[PDB]
């Protein structure tokens, strides 16, 4: 047998069609899994964008991408040091409601 979703299965999201540099510059950090998208899935977006991925909390750390199974520990750090939370769906209207910029040279056929 085979349980779990095999690959990404993309289809049960919606991925806004915002600009190519608005999270460039910003740092993210994925905890936990995800139904929408994998850790994986989710980060290559936010890379996608030119945010930043990693799986820790640190003084840079712009927001924490929670999710499920997740530990109480990463929110605390988090605020302290100032780091706004939100789940799978806030980093999605990010994509929307953060600006864009003009990168020095532009990738022709970009589309999935």
């Known amino acids: 047998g085979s349980s779990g979703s095999s690959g990404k299965a993309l289809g049960s999201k919606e991925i806004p069609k915002g600009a190519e ?3 460039e510059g910003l740092i993210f950090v994925i905890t936990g899994v995800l139904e929408s998208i994998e850790r994986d899935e989710a980060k ?3 890379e996608r964008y030119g945010g930043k991925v990693t799986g ?3 003084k840079k750390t712009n927001y924490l991408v929670m999710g499920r199974d997740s530990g ?3 929110s605390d750090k988090a605020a302290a ?3 706004k939370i ?3 769906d806030g980093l999605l ?5 953060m600006p864009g910029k003009k990168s020095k040279y532009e990738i022709a056929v970009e589309t999935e």
């Open 21 to 23: 540099n608005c999270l």
């Open 44 to 46: 290559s977006l936010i």
């Open 56 to 58: 820790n909390v640190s």
């Open 72 to 74: 109480q520990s990463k």
């Open 81 to 83: 040091l100032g780091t």
């Open 86 to 88: 939100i789940d799978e």
């Open 93 to 97: 209207n990010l994509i929307r409601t």
